[PDB]
Amino acid sequence: GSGMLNRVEDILHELEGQVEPLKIQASIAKDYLEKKKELEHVEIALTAYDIEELHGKWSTLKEKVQMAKESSTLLKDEEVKLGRMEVELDNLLQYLREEYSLSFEGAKEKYQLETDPEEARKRVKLIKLAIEELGTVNLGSIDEFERVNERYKFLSEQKEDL
Amino acid sequence: VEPLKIQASIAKDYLEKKKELEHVEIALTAYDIEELHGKWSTLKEKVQMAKESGGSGGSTLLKDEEVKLGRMEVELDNLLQYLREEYSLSFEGAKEKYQLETDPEEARKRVKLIKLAIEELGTVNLGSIDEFERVN
């Protein structure tokens, strides 16, 4: 014979059971990735905003401290504040590199706030909560669903010759 | 034993992607440092000539550029810190060891893609490589 003993119905039944479950996980995973994308966009914009704002404040204060010197406890208090700003500024800049591989210029160019920063920060919290409420996410299910579904479709729509 | 092979293959794929990620991240950092330093050099020169043109006193446009010049310096310093702290590298070390294979913007897209592919592997057990090599 030129035919096959194994019926395609068997593999189809084995796969059909797998389609819908993977579809659910994949739909959850895509939703997660969408919220993650939104979160990242807002966080990059906030980071660039905070860097420019904080550097501006630190620059100004550092100039006033140095201007006053050239002219004791009060002075020390300002220097402590300068130190705190410097640590925070360094952290923000290094965060930009480590988390996004973006320069400040690159971040600002592509992502700027479209609301006041506090509104953006609240938005960040709300997106994080939404992500958290998705529970356990299986990212691999997106690719796994694609493979299983395409295979199932291939065999289904051509079962007559399989 | 087969559930091990799966686990071990995942672990090795994880290691390979992390190497891939590191190379593009450091290559970009070295590239960005040199580009930023060039922009800083260009702007600093431009600031100087403005003070020579005269009448720039109290100019808010000149002040904006001076603040920008300062922010560039702080960013450069922090990029150098990042190389030291994260990879124990100097700028020249990073540049010489890690060269971009593509244009910078495509590399930036690649960074996010590799990170996602890594995250897609889920929880990785590196020790599965060991107990797999043990079954043989």
Residue numbers in the entry:
A (entry chain A): 184 to 254, 921 to 1011
B (entry chain B): 202 to 257, 919 to 998
Please, what does the article write about this entry?
Multi-subunit SMC complexes control chromosome superstructure and promote chromosome disjunction, conceivably by actively translocating along DNA double helices. SMC subunits comprise an ABC ATPase “head” and a “hinge” dimerization domain connected by a 49 nm coiled-coil “arm. The heads undergo ATP-dependent engagement and disengagement to drive SMC action on the chromosome.
Helix αC3 makes a coiled-coil-like interaction with the middle part of αN1. A short loop joins αC3 to αC4 across αN1. We term the coiled-coil interruption “Smc joint,” as it connects two straight parts of the Smc protein at a slight angle. Importantly, almost all side chains of these residues point toward the same face of the elongated BsSmcCC1 structure as is expected for an element of a rod-shaped Smc dimer.
